[PDB]
Every structure is written in structure tokens, then in C-alpha cells.
């Protein structure tokens, strides 16, 4: 099989500016008919992939002309001019020279915006859940940029490890921000043994790490 | 316009067969093109599985050639994917396509011996703006959908990607930021739908 490589996992870009996304193949994709069989796709969050470029440099039907492709042999570039909010998602190259068709691992396009600090909220476990013998404590980080954010759970000023799970929204198109949810899961027994529950957030937009907490 | 739609079960047990259908609208599958199945694994890696051509000839990815079958019914403009002896590794979103240009919406198939299970829905109570939400916990398989106030509330809503807990059950939260002064004028109800278990739960979220 032909191995397709996209070296960059993600690329940031200021709206209105241009960006180039690289792809490489393990074998030349040039054919004797003159065409180079490298296709480009965009997958927007929650959507099916969509064709952007076929045969290395040909714009597909119904695709904005801000997308263009170039390359030679084993090295290829997708250029996106005048990047807009609708352009966020993952860009994949795919070789189309030999069976089986094979895809690169994708490059995520991130829209770069001004630094935005998250608004932080802590939620104690509901009384309804506390009946079950399990307690979920939730920390919400709302509308922040950039994506990098550290969440530290503290139970009575003690650092927690391996008992929480995080989830992050896809970069939305209304304000180019992310949101994050962190859930600390404890037994009801362990929950009732302690009083102070704290979520400490480290982010570039914050003047200093911010802690939101409650007393059980 | 030409459109494709995948249909089939969302949950299949290991060792059994996965059977999906692609229904093609406003195009005859005998008229041209390759008709592909492409799947996307958790983690987002894409794999081309194979195609059936306009003449019914197949071409399969060598890594699946022993388990896969792609057939068609030209009279119904449908083509089919059959994947035998499935394992957990076959959990993926399955797409049917016409060449590289026209894609279906995709259909998630989870392969697991685990039973279907509806979610618990717990309130995330609000303590300028206030945040509140619902914790949708302990369901299987994906997906769930969450709306607020029957779809009337969309502004400021964040429904997070599900996390797979060590138990093998999923959990997610859906939150919304709201004017603190509206807490006594507008009720907030999350509408949780888990189609695999035939579960519909409305949960009112009020201040603590």
C-alpha cells in the first residue's frame, strides 16, 4: 500500500489570511497520462468529508475557488486563501493512483483569534445522583482561546489524579472559541468524607490560575 | 440532485455480520461511477473499504477481502455492504459515496457484546450570566442528542463530545449560558433523546 503522510496535526490561521497544508506519499502519484492522482478533502465538524481538489490541482464542483492544489511527484500542498470561519475542520489528502486508495492522517485547521479567558463554573453532584452511590462533579470552561487549558481537581486541597475525564467542543464558527467540560467521579462514600471541592484552571487569557470551588 | 443515504443497525455483536445499505436518489447506479464504502474509525482515521462499479464489478481493500462483500440491486438503485465476523475494531462511521464527489451523511456502527442502555439525566444547577446544564450519564451505544426547551433555545448551548467511561458506558454534558435575571422568567428543560434504547427524557433544571 501507498503510505500517505501529513506531517502537521494542526495549523493556526488568522481569518482573511492564507495557509498551506502539506501532504507526502511513499511513491510518486504521477501517471503516464500527465495527471497526478492526489485528492484533497475537508471534513467540517459533525459533517461527512467533502471533496475539494481532484487530480492534485483541479477544483471540484461546488467548491469555493479560495481552495487550490499544487505539488510534484511525492510532495503536495493545499492552499486556502482568505480563510473564513466555515473553513474550520480537518483536511485529508488521499492517493488515487493505486488500489487500495489510502488517506493521510489529516491536518486540523484552527482559526486564530484574540486570546479569550474561559468563564469557569463548578457544579456539585445533584441530590438525585447522590442516591446512586456515585458523585459526579463538573467543571465548565466556557468560550476560550487558545485550546490549551489545564484543569486541576482539588479535594480538600489535595491534588487529584486518574479520577476525572475531560471533553472539548470543536472550534465553533460564531466566536472561534472552545469550551471544555471536566467531570470528577467519586463514590458517594468518598464524596461525603470531604468538604472542599475545587477546580483550578490555567489558561493564557487568565492573569493567574483561577479556582472555582464549593463546600459540600 | 444525486444523494446517498446509509441505513442499517447502530449496534452489532462480535462474530456476527454487519449489513448496511446505501440508497441512491436521483441517479441510476448503472449509469456510471464507482460506488464506494469508506469508514472512519474513532480517532478519525479514514479507510477505503472497496467499491462496486456501474457494471457490478467489485474491488476490495486487501485487508478486508476475506470478510467483505459489496453487492447491489440496480432495480432499486441500492448497493450494500456486508462485513462478516466483526470485532470491536470494526466500530466506525460508515459512509457510502459516488466516486470522491458525492457522500452520504454517514452512519455510526458500534460493535460490542454489551447491551443497549438508556441514560440517566442529572441537572447541573445554576449557582450577569449564569450557566446551567444536564449531565447525560451511563448510556450505550452512541449517540444521544440534546436540545433545550424543545429546540427554542439554541444560543449559548454547548453539547460536549461523549466520553467513554471505564464501565464501557458513555457520559456527556450539555450546558447553556443564560441571563441570571431570566431564571425566574424562563424555565430551562433539556430534552435528551437516546434512539438506540428508545429513551426520551425531559429534565427541568432550576436554581439550587
Amino acid at each position: 500500500d501507498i503510505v500517505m503522510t501529513q506531517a502537521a496535526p494542526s495549523v493556526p490561521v488568522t481569518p482573511g489570511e492564507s495557509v498551506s497544508i502539506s501532504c507526502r506519499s511513499s511513491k510518486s502519484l504521477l501517471h503516464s497520462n500527465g495527471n497526478t492522482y492526489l485528492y484533497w478533502f475537508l471534513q467540517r465538524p459533525g459533517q461527512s468529508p467533502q471533496l475539494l481538489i481532484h487530480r492534485m490541482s483541479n477544483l471540484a464542483s461546488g467548491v469555493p475557488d479560495r481552495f487550490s492544489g499544487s505539488g510534484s511527484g511525492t510532495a503536495f500542498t493545499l492552499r486556502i486563501s482568505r480563510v473564513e470561519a466555515e473553513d474550520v475542520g480537518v483536511y485529508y489528502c488521499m492517493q488515487h493512483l493505486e488500489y487500495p486508495y489510502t488517506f493521510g492522517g489529516g491536518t486540523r485547521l484552527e482559526v486564530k483569534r484574540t486570546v479569550a479567558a474561559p468563564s469557569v463554573f463548578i457544579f456539585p453532584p445533584s441530590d438525585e445522583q447522590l442516591k446512586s452511590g456515585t458523585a459526579s462533579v463538573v467543571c465548565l470552561l466556557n468560550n476560550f482561546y487558545p485550546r490549551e487549558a489545564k484543569v486541576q481537581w482539588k479535594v480538600d486541597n489535595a491534588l487529584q489524579s486518574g479520577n476525572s475525564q475531560e471533553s472539548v467542543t470543536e472550534q465553533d464558527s460564531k466566536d472561534s472559541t472552545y469550551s471544555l467540560s471536566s467531570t470528577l467521579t467519586l463514590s458517594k462514600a468518598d464524596y461525603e468524607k470531604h468538604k472542599v471541592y475545587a477546580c483550578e484552571v490555567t489558561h493564557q487569557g487568565l492573569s493567574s490560575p483561577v479556582t472555582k470551588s464549593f463546600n459540600r | 440532485d444525486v444523494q446517498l443515504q446509509e441505513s442499517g443497525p447502530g449496534l452489532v455483536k462480535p462474530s456476527q455480520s454487519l449489513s448496511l445499505t446505501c440508497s441512491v436518489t436521483d441517479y441510476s447506479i448503472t449509469s456510471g461511477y464507482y460506488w464506494n464504502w469508506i469508514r472512519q474509525f474513532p480517532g478519525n482515521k479514514l479507510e477505503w473499504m472497496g467499491y462496486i462499479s456501474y457494471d457490478g464489478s467489485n474491488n476490495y481493500n486487501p485487508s478486508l477481502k476475506n470478510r467483505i462483500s459489496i453487492t447491489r440491486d440496480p432495480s432499486k438503485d441500492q448497493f450494500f455492504l456486508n462485513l462478516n465476523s466483526v470485532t470491536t475494531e470494526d466500530t466506525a462511521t460508515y459512509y457510502c459515496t459516488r466516486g470522491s464527489l458525492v457522500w452520504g451523511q454517514g452512519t455510526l456502527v458500534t460493535v460490542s457484546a454489551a447491551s443497549t442502555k438508556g441514560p440517566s439525566v442529572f441537572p447541573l444547577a445554576p449557582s450577569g450570566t449564569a450557566a446551567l446544564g444536564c449531565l447525560v450519564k451511563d448510556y450505550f451505544p452512541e449517540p444521544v442528542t440534546v436540545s433545550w426547551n424543545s429546540g427554542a433555545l439554541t444560543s449559548g448551548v454547548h453539547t460536549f463530545p461523549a466520553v467513554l467511561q471505564s464501565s464501557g458506558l458513555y457520559s456527556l454534558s450539555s450546558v447553556v449560558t443564560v441571563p441570571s435575571s431570566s431564571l425566574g422568567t424562563q424555565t430551562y428543560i433539556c430534552n435528551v433523546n437516546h434512539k438506540p434504547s428508545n429513551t426520551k427524557v425531559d429534565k427541568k433544571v432550576e436554581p439550587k
Binding site: 495527471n35 | 456510471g32 464507482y34
Partner: peptide, 8 residues
């Protein structure tokens, strides 16, 4: 041709 064959 390695491309997808179109309409006949």
C-alpha cells in the same frame, strides 16, 4: 485511467 469513470 486511475480516476473514477464517469457517465457512460
Amino acid at each position: 485511467s486511475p480516476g473514477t469513470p464517469g457517465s457512460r
